[PDB]
Design an enzyme around this catalytic site. Structure first.
Site, short mmCIF file in Angstrom:
data_model
loop_
_atom_site.label_atom_id
_atom_site.label_comp_id
_atom_site.label_asym_id
_atom_site.label_seq_id
_atom_site.Cartn_x
_atom_site.Cartn_y
_atom_site.Cartn_z
N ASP A 1 -6.01 -24.58 36.07
CA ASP A 1 -5.97 -23.40 35.32
C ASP A 1 -7.34 -22.86 35.03
OD1 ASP A 1 -2.52 -23.60 34.08
OD2 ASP A 1 -3.39 -22.30 35.90
N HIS B 1 -4.05 -24.91 42.47
CA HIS B 1 -5.08 -24.45 41.33
C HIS B 1 -4.93 -25.23 40.18
CE1 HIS B 1 -1.93 -21.90 40.05
NE2 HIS B 1 -2.48 -21.83 38.69
N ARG C 1 3.80 -18.85 29.06
CA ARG C 1 2.84 -19.82 28.64
C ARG C 1 1.93 -19.59 27.62
NH1 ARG C 1 -2.70 -19.36 31.56
NH2 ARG C 1 -2.20 -20.46 33.80
N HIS D 1 -1.38 -27.25 40.33
CA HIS D 1 -0.12 -26.83 40.30
C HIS D 1 0.04 -25.62 41.15
CE1 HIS D 1 -1.73 -24.81 36.63
NE2 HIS D 1 -0.92 -23.77 37.00
C1 LIG Z 1 -2.63 -17.15 43.03
C2 LIG Z 1 -3.45 -18.33 41.95
C3 LIG Z 1 -3.65 -17.68 40.49
C4 LIG Z 1 -2.90 -18.50 39.55
C5 LIG Z 1 -2.78 -17.83 38.20
C6 LIG Z 1 -1.39 -17.41 37.73
C7 LIG Z 1 -1.69 -15.79 37.54
C8 LIG Z 1 -3.19 -19.01 37.27
O1 LIG Z 1 -4.18 -18.17 36.28
S1 LIG Z 1 -5.16 -19.08 35.44
O2 LIG Z 1 -4.82 -19.14 34.13
O3 LIG Z 1 -6.80 -18.33 35.67
O4 LIG Z 1 -5.69 -20.43 36.02
O1 LIG Z 2 4.73 -19.73 37.51
C1 LIG Z 2 4.43 -20.84 37.42
O2 LIG Z 2 5.42 -21.91 37.50
C2 LIG Z 2 2.99 -21.60 37.01
C3 LIG Z 2 2.25 -20.29 37.14
C4 LIG Z 2 0.82 -20.89 36.73
O3 LIG Z 2 -0.06 -21.19 37.58
C5 LIG Z 2 0.35 -21.27 35.18
O4 LIG Z 2 0.99 -20.63 34.36
O5 LIG Z 2 -0.58 -21.90 35.02
FE LIG Z 3 -1.64 -21.85 36.77
#
Ligand SMILES: CCCC[C@@H](CC)COS(=O)(=O)O
Ligand SMILES: O=C(O)CCC(=O)C(=O)O
Ligand SMILES: [Fe+2]
Ligand SMILES: CCCC[C@@H](CC)COS(=O)(=O)O
Ligand SMILES: CCCC[C@@H](CC)COS(=O)(=O)O
Ligand SMILES: CCCC[C@@H](CC)COS(=O)(=O)O
Ligand SMILES: O=C(O)CCC(=O)C(=O)O
Ligand SMILES: O=C(O)CCC(=O)C(=O)O
Ligand SMILES: O=C(O)CCC(=O)C(=O)O
Ligand SMILES: [Fe+2]
Ligand SMILES: [Fe+2]
Ligand SMILES: [Fe+2]
Lengths: 254, 254, 240, 240
Positions: free
Chosen positions: B89, B87, B233, B218
């Protein structure tokens, strides 16, 4: 003006009031050739007078018969006594047949249909960006012993209609990994066999079908078990396919 | 001139001899921003002095922190305590983040890696006819509550590099049936995650990663069982994506 | 009775001649119709031009209990509910001159043709069907009259329960590709006054949308069905 | 012995420290190495810069019988033959400065994570492997030391026996997608003098081709393996 009755919405027409023979006039022949280009597959019922020599002589009026062994007392007649896989005939060669004329000799009481798909309608229905991609693709066809490179889209030598050239003899799309080739083929081939682009014929002894092999694929349904089914085909020599940019197919292994 | 050590052949670099803080000079910041555009993801080890407020203040030097609830004593800090799906973000929104800064607080003794993929290298490696198709595609991203239309190919606002914009939030490619959408997505997404385009990082407490979210995806590997894993983060506000023809993404449901 | 029954394709579909449908058919004819239906999955009666709305509904009532609620996608009717219809009776009022066909697939033949290991896996799968109601049905249904096992899939399936999206898609594509394999199907070209009845427990169907703006009008009565039973005897359940 | 063993990823891969490989290792060390290998599927020794061609071959001889014969595609070594290698020992002679990694996948973990109905189907499948030799192997192998079941797939697989091409492709994609799921893999970045040994009975691997024209030279000894046994006890067989 033939008595032409369309069978499905986008392909296929039965032609009535015509008895096929080696003695048909140029006008009937021309009107048959035109119904064929327009409808992609045409059907003639009750051709019970027709026989091996007579089928072959009729064929001669539509083009040049070509050997694909052959039915005896004939030069060109092939018997099929199971082609249940979508395909355009002989595309593993450069100048594959332009048309085929198929007569039902023995017809199962239930099952044994044939289905055709219109690959020109399949091309036209693609969203523009996908037509533009298809215009650029080349595929390797193979009987694995021949391998021929054909463009995925062929410009029809008479109508000028573009049509997809895919089917069972395609081994891969040139320039692409195996995974990507499989996905690209699945998208384009999926549009060929979408039900809207197809017509299914239930055979009776004495039915004759002729189809434009430049713009169809077909499939023989194997649902008839041990019921006898015998059909006899004459195939007509075709031209080297031309792609959208004017490039020509080329055999690359023999 | 930073001490930059590339991790994989096509993406990823560790930056040594730098201690991240809210007080870094414009030159170090600029050299960090450039290493980031070039390498797509950068890594800093031994940032054990860093803390919540300090991570947030460092982030402020690279862009404008934006809320995605948040870690206490902070405005912007998000905790993750499992994102094992490829994905980019927040692409379900119009102007999704340009970059993310991620710090390892607790790191499993075995497992818990993160992997990034370079979507600009993924775009460049496509055969030309497939790049031309990708240039024309649009995809609907969704958190199913938002739905946003993004071009499949984004022109990077700083480098001008084209990169694929796909990932887990894509619901469909606009203009295509479900079957065709699935095949087109699978081809293009398959090139993003091809191993050559990826780099995998094994975390140690105090490691910090920053990645350019405009040109990566990622994946957090969920192989660590019940071992504790805590990361924090900060995400930086991004621009509206521009496609190859200059069209802009647009949110279409909210 | 011995009906005049003429099979259309090799593995599904039969035309029944010499019968004029009506609310006044005797128990023997109705039984012989029910039997042809079970056996052939979809049955066709031509020349039913005397029939009308009230008369179709009364004929339907002899075959089960009628129940209130361009379909060019393969589906089993209403499988997003628990006790979806056992059968549908469909009359052609206006038929396009070219196009407008309907295709049926035999999901019992599709099941039987799977290799044994694949049938065993199918016998264990459950799928979520949805009209986005959400209902869990077994992928394999044991037919309440014949005991025949039949695949329960089609357009209402959202996912196979217990699998990732990618796995679900692969598993659905294998099993659904067997249902729609040409050998398991029959295509009917309609004429005004044709009536089709199919066993919705053991088929899917698809209305071909190749007729453009030609008028096409068909009228359907649907008959109430039972809750599906899987191979292990578990029952379908609505969950949303 | 108790070796100094440091797991690399959560479900495969361990670095072994405090051991200098050589043709003179004692039976206890060799046993503890064989055990770490069975357990972790691939094991890594760094700093083996004293090692050379003759010395690698002699060390290998302690682990089994050595046997004569850019790999960026997932594969199990030589599965196109009946008794393909049980293990390979691989030394990095020249290592690119960036890129050049190798990834391994644990095909025993990939099997165990399948839902039960899917494991049962896998236990029944056979596949044809080919270097176009053609050999039939069970999709699930019972490991001759641990008894662990592991998927036997990868790039040499031509088709799954008993299925159409389309079905074979779907079935292979599900089972092979479990093998290569990131969670079941470990990626190693090489330094000159690193040695990896993996249990070729329960892994696949992939050499990443991201290093361009940088020099990369690795040396491999491969150890002879047994004929695979399936869950029912049938044996692999070469057929062409
Ligand atoms: C399982 C895919 C969801 C990944 C999430 C981590 C909680 C990243 O969220 S994001 O910031 O909306 O891209
Ligand atoms: O847990 C991680 O290593 C990355 C999680 C993630 O997708 C993010 O913080 O954007
Ligand atoms: Fe992410
Ligand atoms: C099963 C696909 C083969 C189809 C055959 C019929 C024997 C058609 O042969 S062809 O003339 O070479 O195209
Ligand atoms: C596109 C297929 C949906 C079919 C609908 C017609 C809109 C009817 O089928 S039903 O809802 O299962 O009764
Ligand atoms: C592309 C993958 C093939 C791998 C080859 C290297 C050319 C080595 O593997 S092996 O033949 O199974 O021993
Ligand atoms: O058997 C049929 O109906 C057609 C077989 C076939 O593919 C052909 O003759 O070209
Ligand atoms: O219109 C048809 O032919 C069938 C439509 C349909 O799916 C139905 O009536 O259940
Ligand atoms: O070069 C590598 O890293 C592995 C190549 C390979 O597949 C092997 O040696 O068996
Ligand atoms: Fe043919
Ligand atoms: Fe329906
Ligand atoms: Fe190998």
């Amino acid at each position: 003006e033939l008595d032409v009755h369309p069978v499905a919405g986008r392909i296929g027409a039965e032609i009535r009031g015509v008895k096929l023979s080696p003695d048909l006039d140029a006008a009937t022949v021309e009107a048959i050739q035109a119904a064929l280009v327009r409808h992609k597959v045409i059907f003639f019922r009750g051709q019970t007078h027709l026989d091996d020599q007579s089928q072959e002589g009729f064929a001669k009026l539509l083009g040049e018969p070509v050997a694909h062994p052959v039915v005896d007392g004939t030069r060109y007649l092939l018997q099929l006594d199971r082609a249940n896989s979508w395909h355009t005939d002989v595309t593993f060669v450069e100048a594959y047949p332009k048309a085929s004329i198929l007569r039902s000799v023995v017809a199962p009481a239930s099952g044994g249909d044939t289905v055709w798909a219109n690959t020109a309608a399949a091309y036209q229905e693609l969203p523009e960006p996908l037509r533009e991609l298809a215009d650029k693709l080349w595929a390797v066809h193979s009987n694995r012993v021949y391998e021929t490179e054909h463009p995925v889209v062929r410009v029809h030598p008479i109508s000028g209609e573009r049509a997809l050239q895919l089917g069972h003899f395609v081994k891969r799309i040139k320039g692409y990994s195996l995974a990507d080739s499989q996905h690209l083929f699945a998208v384009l081939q999926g549009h060929v066999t979408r039900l809207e682009n197809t017509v299914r014929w239930r055979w009776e002894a004495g039915d004759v079908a002729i189809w434009d092999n430049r713009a169809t694929q077909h499939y023989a349904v194997d649902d008839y078990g041990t019921q006898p089914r015998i059909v006899r085909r004459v195939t007509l020599a075709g031209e080297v396919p031309v792609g959208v940019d004017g490039q020509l197919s080329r055999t690359t292994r023999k």
